């Protein structure tokens with residue numbers, strides 16, 4: 001997260017760290033006792049399931065905490081529609097090897113219905129332990145970073161991404177995607193933040209509106225963060241989790 005600030009411990013109790021061979025690679029969101037939502041691109045097919053971990057209830061990643069819990073995975077389920085970087089269906093269900101117990105630091109985030117609308121300009125928050133500027137790691141002890149970002153429609157976002165665009169690149173915001181951020185630079189999600197939550201406030205609660213997907217160099221002007229809409233996968237998630245509950 002660039003241009004953000006340190007969250008307080010336990011402020012975003014659904015935020016998880018996802019590691020591969022012990023190294024933080026992506027964020028994710030706890031959605032029940034045994035399921036985490038993240039981005040499909042965080043889990044390439046050649047990676048071994050047994051090499052992944054999920055760390056829950058953490059604030060400072062490098063610090064020891066009696067409140068943090070670490071789990072391995074029983075299953076990794078990317079949406080079948082996911083193909084390459086930038087494509088639709090950039091969402092994955094992760095089943096923990098065993099269910100965990102909720103605590104003051106470990107709590108699930110409510111999922112939006114298929115027809116939940118979050119209005120343009122709604123001030124949501126994106127969180128993560130990703131880079132704090134292009135190619136600059138968050139410094140040890142790595143406290144969780146947070147950033148308020150207003151929602152930006154895919155249509156405006158596509159227009160923004162078309163400004164000074166690299167010809168050879170797709171930067172197409174798909175029908176299952178939304179953006180959030182600022183036309184000017186400075187404040188955005190970065191590498192290491194992907195797969196994590198865009199939490200939006202509705203009727204006294206917080207919903208998982210978006211899963212950090214992709215973007216240009218983080219914090220560049222005309223390049224706000226791109227998110228997969230959880231609403232686009234409401235039915236699929238409910239089906240998968242119920243069959244495998």
Ligand SMILES: *C(=O)c1ccc(NC(=N)N)cc1
Nearest residue numbers: 190191192194214215216225
């Ligand atoms: C994920 O690691 C990720 C998401 C988004 C960006 N770029 C922008 N937010 N512009 C980089 C990396």
